[PDB]
Each structure stands twice: as C-alpha cells, then as structure tokens.
Design a protein around this ligand. Sequence first.
Ligand SMILES: O=P(O)(O)O[C@H]1OC[C@@H](O)[C@H](O)[C@H]1O
Ligand SMILES: [Zn+2]
Length: 455
Amino acid sequence: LPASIFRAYDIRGVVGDTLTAETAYWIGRAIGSESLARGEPCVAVGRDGRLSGPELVKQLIQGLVDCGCQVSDVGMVPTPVLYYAANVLEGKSGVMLTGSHNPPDYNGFKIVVAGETLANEQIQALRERIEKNDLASGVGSVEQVDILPRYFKQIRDDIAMAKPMKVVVDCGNGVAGVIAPQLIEALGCSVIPLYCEVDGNFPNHHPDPGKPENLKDLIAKVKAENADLGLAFDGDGDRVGVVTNTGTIIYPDRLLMLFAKDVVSRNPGADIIFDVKCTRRLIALISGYGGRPVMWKTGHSLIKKKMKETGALLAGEMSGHVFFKERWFGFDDGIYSAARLLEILSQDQRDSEHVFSAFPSDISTPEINITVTEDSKFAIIEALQRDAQWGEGNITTLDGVRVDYPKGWGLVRASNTTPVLVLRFEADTEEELERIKTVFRNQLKAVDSSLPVPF
Ligand SMILES: O=P(O)(O)O[C@H]1OC[C@@H](O)[C@H](O)[C@H]1O
Ligand SMILES: [Zn+2]
C-alpha cells in the first residue's frame, strides 16, 4: 500500500488512486490485529455519506471479521456517533470510514483501539503490520446495530433549552443531515434546513465550515429568515461553524470562550485544552474563571490523547473540533457541541450577536498557507526551532513555533494533512499585527530566502 495515506492523525486518501477496496480490506486486517493485541475483540464500524462508502466499508468489515473480531456495524452515521458507539457498546474499539471535509473522491479511516485514538507512530504501526504480514487470522462475526436513536435520546435528555430559538442548519449535503436538523428541532427549536439531503456529490458547497465562502448561503438565510443563529457542519459532523443573528462568523476559539465559562462554572480548576491556532484571549479568559488553560498541538487525535493525559473537561481547535468531557465522553462532536451552544444561548435574554460581542477580541488574520514540499515541511520547522530569533516574547515549540507577545501572537507550523506551512497572526492593533508579521517574514527568510512570504 502507498505510505502517503498513513498520516499523523488518521488514514486519508483518494478513492481510485491511493485508496481502493483492497486497501480497505488490509487496513481492516491491521486494525483488527491491533485491537486484538490490546485485548479487544469487539470493534464498531461506521461510514459517512460518501459515494465510496458502501464499497469500502464492506471490505473494512471483512478485514476485521477475518481477524476473529466481533464487528458492530452501525451503518451510515456521523463520525461522533461512531465514537459514541465505541463508548457505549461492549467494545472500546471503533473505525469510522470518512473523508471528513474533503472533495467527493476522498475517503479515509479514523481509528480508536481499546479506548485510544491512534496517531503518529501508531498509524505507522498499522502500515508496518501489513508490510510484515503481522496479522491476526480468525473467524469473526458482524452484528448490525441501530445506534442513532440511542445517541439522539442521550443528547435530548441531557439538554434543557430555556426558550424557543429559530435556527438555520447547513449540513453541506454531508452525513449530519441524518440527525442534526431533527435533533435540534427536538431540543425546542424551529429549524430551517439548508443542504440537509445526504448527497456524496456535494453539489452545493464543500462541507467545510472553516472557510467563510462555505457559510455565505447560511449567512444570507439567517438574515432573510430573521433567525436567531446559523449552524454549519462539516462532511462527517465532527466540526461545527457558527453564525450570529446578524451574520457574524463566530470562530471556534471564541465559541470555546463561551463553553469554557460554562464548564468551569461547575468545575473549579478544570483543565481546558485549545490548539496553537487559537486566540491568546482564551488563555486569559480560562484563567480568569479559575480554569487551567492548556495549549496543545493541532490535530483532533492529538487533542484527544491530551484530554486523557490531563483529565481536561473540555477542548477545542480553531478548525471547529470541539471535545466535551463534562456531561459527555470526551470525543469531538459538532452535533453535541451545537446542542450545548443552543442550551447556553437559550438561557440568555440577549441575542447571539450580543452574547459573543461581550468577550474581548483581537484583530485576526485569515489563515495563511504556503505550499512547500511534503518532504521539506518538517525540516523548515526544525530549522526555525533551531535557528530563529523572535525578540522578547513567550516562545512555544510544541507544534511549530508560536510566539506570544504583550499585544499579540504569531504562529508557523507544518500541516499534517497537506504539503503546506500554516500561519496565524492576531493582535490588538493593526500596527502590532504588522510588527509581528514582519518578525515572522524575516525569520522565514533567514531560514530560506527563497520561501514565499504571502503576508
Ligand atoms: O492540516 P492540519 O492543520 O494539520 O489539521 C487540520 O485537520 C485536522 C484538524 O483536527 C485540525 O484542527 C486542522 O487544522
Ligand atoms: Zn470532520
């Protein structure tokens, strides 16, 4: 199999190119073998609404069965519903067949084995099992499990909306359409659906709420319908995007401020995790409410591992993966997070625009991406970590280099999903924003004067 599909957080490829039915089978065999090695014969399997789902999921299941595993086939569900299954069924292992927010032809595997979400060397270990034929053999079984109603009920029973809300819900023709509009209605909302038909061709916009262009239709509908809030889900439902009644995009780091206040209010001293892409304003906010802010690496699998390490009750990423442990299970879930948000907003007499505008804000850049090579991106970062000079500030090298100054911050890191360098800048004035950008531009140039600096 191609090595390129085995990434830091999960397995991801293009069907008909780097991913085939045969690939899914052997990946199934590798996951089954690892699960068995960890004492777990029971594995849940889910798939999103992609065109290739039916073909690949059958092979993934057969690979697991051929290890001797007992598979629980939960059918077509959002990613968090698969994670849910791997928390409430007999087994603590689960595999989700998903291409996340990517174009129609993409697919992949998100993997939990004996409670732990695999990343880094563990994903490489799967690749290595297949190369070595270090694989279990046995006569397993498959049982169909209808888990969506249990998930639905578990959320509905945990949430208490104080007053009715009107909410536009954009599923991007992804799999969140199987539950999100129905569940949000059941919580006590009027729901205006947008692109909620599950359609793996994604004929409307990419199901990627992290890009403002993909929220354009949502913003317009919120305004046209006088809605209280707009919500968007990514293709597999583990990311959420948020729009106020006035059409303001609420980025996930600011969403996390509202959630952090909520969680810490009931859990003094709770650890709250956020990734290196999130606003410095989060650090002060969590600390002020008596929480312990923990900055960590970008990447859903890595955040999940850190949750376990720290006992954190809540985590969030700038990309919109939000992880509730309090009242929940600790995995990322856009649908649950949407429910938690609606609960909080419903208990405030103010509109969603004013609830969010109350929090301090910096001036933030849109994300900067610089295309480099897959085989040079980590070396550029290593070079910066070795050689760079940042002036006076708090320097963090846990993921790339982030520097926090008195009045702003900057970040450069390697993407683990694309051959690019990712940069973020934010400051409380335009002047400071430019000063920080200049520092970073000069440090990049000092490593390699030929690097593009599109900022
Ligand atoms: O390409 P990366 O930045 O490495 O990862 C992205 O895709 C995975 C998400 O968990 C991250 O938050 C998102 O930023
Ligand atoms: Zn996703």
